[PDB]
């Protein structure tokens, strides 16, 4: 199905639902279980050393003396996941 759409003013911030740890980016924010509660975290960095690997989250709500590297079984996948947007610019 398809229909006309329109742009008009639309803000950016792209929400889709994953199921796996490999697609996440530093760019990409998920939730995080902690103290049997659910934040959201930003990712800052992957590292993939390790089975499962490991990944680089940080606390929005909290500093950044918060974050930690948290492995997949910390990671929430039943909450939707926040993607960067991408436009053309061709600006200098």
Not at 12 to 18: F, R, V
Not at 20 to 35: P, T
Not at 40 to 46: K, M, N, T
Not at 60 to 69: A, S
């Given at each position: 199905?398809?229909?006309m759409?329109?742009?008009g003013?639309?803000?950016?911030?792209?929400?889709?639902?994953?199921?796996?740890?490999?697609?996440?980016?530093?760019?990409?924010?998920?939730?995080?279980?902690?103290?049997?509660e659910?934040?959201?975290?930003?990712?800052?960095?992957?590292?993939?050393?390790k089975?499962?690997?490991?990944?680089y989250?940080?606390?929005?709500?909290?500093?950044?003396?918060?974050?930690?590297?948290?492995?997949?079984?910390?990671?929430?996948?039943?909450?939707?996941?926040l993607?960067?947007?991408?436009?053309?610019?061709?600006?200098?």
């Amino acid at each position: 199905g398809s229909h006309m759409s329109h742009d008009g003013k639309e803000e950016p911030g792209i929400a889709k639902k994953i199921n796996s740890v490999d697609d996440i980016i530093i760019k990409c924010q998920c939730w995080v279980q902690k103290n049997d509660e659910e934040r959201l975290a930003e990712i800052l960095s992957i590292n993939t050393r390790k089975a499962p690997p490991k990944f680089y989250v940080h606390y929005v709500n909290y500093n950044k003396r918060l974050d930690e590297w948290i492995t997949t079984d910390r990671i929430n996948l039943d909450k939707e996941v926040l993607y960067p947007k991408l436009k053309a610019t061709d600006e200098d």
